[PDB]
């Protein structure tokens, strides 16, 4: 239903080990489709999903030229940040940027995003109006003024409302088999004794796409959020995801506990119980 495209840039200075390294990856929803590494032999934007390979030589050459220029822009940005923060040339620092567009269920732009960070902290963000900026600190206000003066936001708004939505819609169509056909989780409950008087019930969801999912444990139809251990959703490596939720149960009460799975690939939310063999 809802879809999004995002690009993630990481630029890191490496004093005494090499020139600054720049990495860019692009995602449609939870599927990576391009990458660029300034450290690779002969840096090029490379495909990372089958459906992007259909693009012509000018696409790959155009992306590669843009990424090379961006890597050079962020080299400069790292030097500029050293000024604003009065930092030495000896340490390694990181600039990050993430930007892209969100489409609502109708396939039209729902929201645009553009955020930058310095050393892991918010630096500057384009506001939801796509016309003004939010600076996290006084250094970022220096950048904010330069970007207002150079009409940066108008150019980014044009990209986010235009080419971003326009290329995302094209990628979704070209990759509809995998991008628009959700995989429901395969689910089961496992039981692990802790002692003769207690056990862990673990609710598993495997092989699902996209990554969004809800796993909850209920006791007598009551939710047990405080007593549920949730691991973060993790990639299986084949473009699907995994998650589990666990609860510690007194022996003899196992059948009062139900696991509830909500995932867009499922017609109705599943309800599961320990089904001992």
């Amino acid at each position: 239903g809802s879809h999004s495209m995002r690009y993630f840039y990481t630029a890191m200075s490496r004093p005494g080990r090499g020139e600054p390294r720049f990495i860019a990856v692009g995602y449609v929803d939870d599927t990576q489709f391009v990458r660029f590494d300034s450290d690779a032999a002969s840096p090029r934007t490379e495909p990372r999903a089958p459906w992007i390979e259909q693009e012509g030589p000018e696409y790959w050459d155009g992306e590669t030229r843009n990424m090379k220029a961006s890597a050079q822009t962020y080299r400069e940005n790292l030097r500029i940040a050293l000024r604003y923060y009065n930092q030495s040339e000896a340490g390694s620092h990181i600039i990050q940027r993430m930007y892209g567009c969100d489409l609502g269920p109708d396939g039209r732009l729902l929201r645009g995003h553009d955020q930058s960070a310095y050393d892991g902290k918010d630096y500057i963000a384009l506001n939801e109006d796509l016309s003004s900026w939010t600076a996290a600190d006084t250094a970022a206000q220096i950048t904010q003024r330069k970007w207002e003066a150079a009409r940066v936001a108008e150019q980014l708004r044009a990209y986010l409302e235009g080419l971003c939505v326009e290329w995302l819609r094209r990628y979704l169509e070209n990759g509809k088999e995998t991008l628009q056909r959700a995989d429901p989780p395969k689910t089961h409950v496992t039981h692990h004794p802790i002692s003769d008087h207690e056990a862990t019930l673990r609710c598993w969801a495997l092989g699902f796409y996209p990554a969004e999912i809800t796993l909850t444990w209920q006791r007598d139809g009551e939710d047990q959020t405080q007593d549920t251990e949730l691991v973060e959703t993790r990639p299986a490596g084949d473009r699907t995801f995994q998650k589990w939720a666990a609860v510690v149960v007194p022996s003899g009460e196992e059948q009062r506990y139900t696991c509830h799975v909500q995932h867009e690939g499922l017609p109705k939310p599943l309800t599961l119980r320990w089904e001992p063999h």
């Binding site: 992306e63 990424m67 940005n77 940066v152």
Partner: peptide, 9 residues
């Protein structure tokens, strides 16, 4: 398709 960086920090 990626945006083109417009301007410096």
């Amino acid at each position: 398709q990626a945006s083109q960086d417009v301007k410096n920090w």
